[PDB]
Amino acid sequence: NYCNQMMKSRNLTKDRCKPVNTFVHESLADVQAVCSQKNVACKNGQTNCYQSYSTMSITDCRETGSSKYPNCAYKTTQANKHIIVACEGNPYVPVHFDASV
């Protein structure tokens, strides 16, 4: 399971099971460019969010109903969609993953 392997390798489920996480299959530079595209509001109402002009390759990792510490288990779902990142700093880069439409 790609999700079970990647959540672990990346230190997300080494000490706990995280319910959901999204992985983006694009170059780092292309995702950082989003912070300069379509400005939109973030869920929390803040407006330092941006939506990608085009869809990107991503896979959603979602914990199943029968997942519990030590043995976290995920359902893997590949898709192409517009990402939304919240941005911050200088260089203005992504600090959070707010969504994917």
Binding site: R10, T22, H25, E26, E88, P94, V95, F97
Partner: peptide, 15 residues
């Protein structure tokens, strides 16, 4: 220690 941008890349980038 880990910044917010480095953390974001580690948790979400799989170039």
């Amino acid at each position: 220690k880990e910044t917010a941008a480095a953390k974001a890349e580690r948790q979400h980038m799989d170039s």
